[PDB]
Structure 1
Amino acid sequence: DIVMTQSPSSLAMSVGQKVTMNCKSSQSLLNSSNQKNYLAWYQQKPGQSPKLLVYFASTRESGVPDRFIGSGSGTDFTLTISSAQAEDLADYFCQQYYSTPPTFGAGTKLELKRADAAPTVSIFPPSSEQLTSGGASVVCFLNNFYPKDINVKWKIDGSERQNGVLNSWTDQDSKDSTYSMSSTLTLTKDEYERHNSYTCEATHKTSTSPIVKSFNRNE
């Protein structure tokens, strides 16, 4: 059971700059009978099957752009992207086929760097449909921001609320390299009706100035 270790777990680089991803195995994958290394690289974008980029450590699959270069030998291999493009956002996996069972590395996520961008914040009251059934989900979208670190805070009538909050992050957008985040405050209908103002706050550790969006149940 050859262990394929991929370092680091995630990689961040600006558009146009060089990306180098490492993959460590446990045994030499070079065959001295024809001088070839038994290693392959795969690119997997969000929602898609893995796609073969490089086979035999350095042979590029027909159709892969020339900016993808594979190198290495023995137990240390490298995937180089000579100039990262917006579309290259993906998870990159190495795989050995020297001995059964074929094993894959845990993958290295490629993140793109770009200028800071404040989230576009939208807050939504519970729909009447949900309220009729006894529920009250207050939804807040924090869309198209950078960098990934962002902390949402919920306040009900001015007081912080932490119970009933569930958060969800998209993968980095392959067009503008931003992130988006969804935050749902799930309350009962009775508790939602017991208060008036609901506030979603987008904060980040580097600043004290949040981005605030609120609504009033009555107006």
Structure 2
Amino acid sequence: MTQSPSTLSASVGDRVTITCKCQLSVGYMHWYQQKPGKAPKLLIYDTSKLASGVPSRFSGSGSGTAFTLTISSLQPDDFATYYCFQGSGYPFTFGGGTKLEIKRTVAAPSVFIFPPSDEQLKSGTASVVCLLNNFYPREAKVQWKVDNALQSGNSQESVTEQDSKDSTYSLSSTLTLSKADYEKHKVYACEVTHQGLSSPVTKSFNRGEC
């Protein structure tokens, strides 16, 4: 069926309303809360019944073709993907989801760089890792510079799901080089640009300093 909004960023204390519209009339609706990569948790059954162990903060309403989920005053631990489920009539279907992000104040990332281990180098490859820890907003630009030369196409990033306590993110950028190419250069630098930074932070090391 149709769920909206697909995504939403809202501040703590905000009131949030999620909607599921079915083309077919529906008897009752169920709502689930799913924390990233974790199993869904039943929040509401029979359209408006709060399930056991669910904050009165959440409530469900609706009839006919439109049903809603409401969180009266959002909070950090409400970060999750919400889903409505229609099991009252055929075909049984889930909504497409509403991923809820929690807004918080800007927090600058703590940046760290890690040189490849001697052990990995032995295997013929060099991975250089840059960590940006506990920041917000999620947008951040990390550029790798080898001997001051800007790298392109040889690194991958991975971002953490929003923290359920501090509403922050962590990111890793990983640069992969052949042992051959890695030993062809001296300084490896990770330059980080972020809203909470008045000026880009750079973490680096010289191949062989340790």
TM-score by length of 2: 0.94
Q: Secondary structure at the match of 1:26?
A: coil
Instruction: Provide the residue aligned with 2:44 in structure 1.
Output: 54
How far 1:26 moved relative to its partner?
Answer: 1.4
* Structure 2: gaps (5+ residues): none
Deviation at 1:174, TM superposition (A): 0.6
**Mapped partners of 2:192, 2:24: distance in 1:** 48
Question: How many residues of Structure 1 are paired with residues of Structure 2 in the alignment?
Answer: 209
* 1:87 is the counterpart of 2:61: no
Aligned with residue 122 of structure 1, among 109, 112, 117: 112
1: CA distance, partners of 2:90 / 2:33: 22
Q: Structure 2 CA distance, aligned partners of 1:26 and 1:199?
A: 55
Match of 2:188 in 1: 198
1:170 to partner: Cα distance: 0.8
Deviation (angstroms), 1:140: 0.6
Q: CA deviation at 1:6?
A: 1.5
Residues 126-153 of structure 1, C-alpha deviation per residue, up to 9 Å, x if partnerless?
Answer: 0000101101000011111100111111
- Partner of residue 35, structure 1: none
- Aligned residue in 2 for 1:133: 123
- Residue 23 in 1 paired to residue 14 in 2? no
Give the letter for the 2:166 counterpart: D
Alignment map for 1:59-208 (pairs within 5 Å) = 59-204=49-194
Q: Does 1:215 align with 2:198?
A: no
Mean CA deviation greater in 196-205 or 162-171: 196-205
Structure 1 residue 87 displacement after superposition: 1.3
Gap regions ≥5 residues in structure 1: 31-37
Q: Percent identity?
A: 61
Q: 2:34 touches 2:40 (CA, 8 Å); kept in 1?
A: yes
State the 4+ residue runs in structure 1 displaced beyond 2 angstroms.
98-101, 204-209
Higher mean C-alpha deviation, range 90-99 or range 198-207: 198-207
Secondary structure (helix, strand or coil) at the match of 1:131 reads helix
Q: Distance in 1 between matches of 2:143 and 2:21?
A: 41
C-alpha contact 2:137 2:195 (8 A) present in aligned 1: no
- TM-score of the two chains, using structure 1 as the length reference: 0.90
**Structure 1 residue 45, shift from structure 2 partner:** 0.8
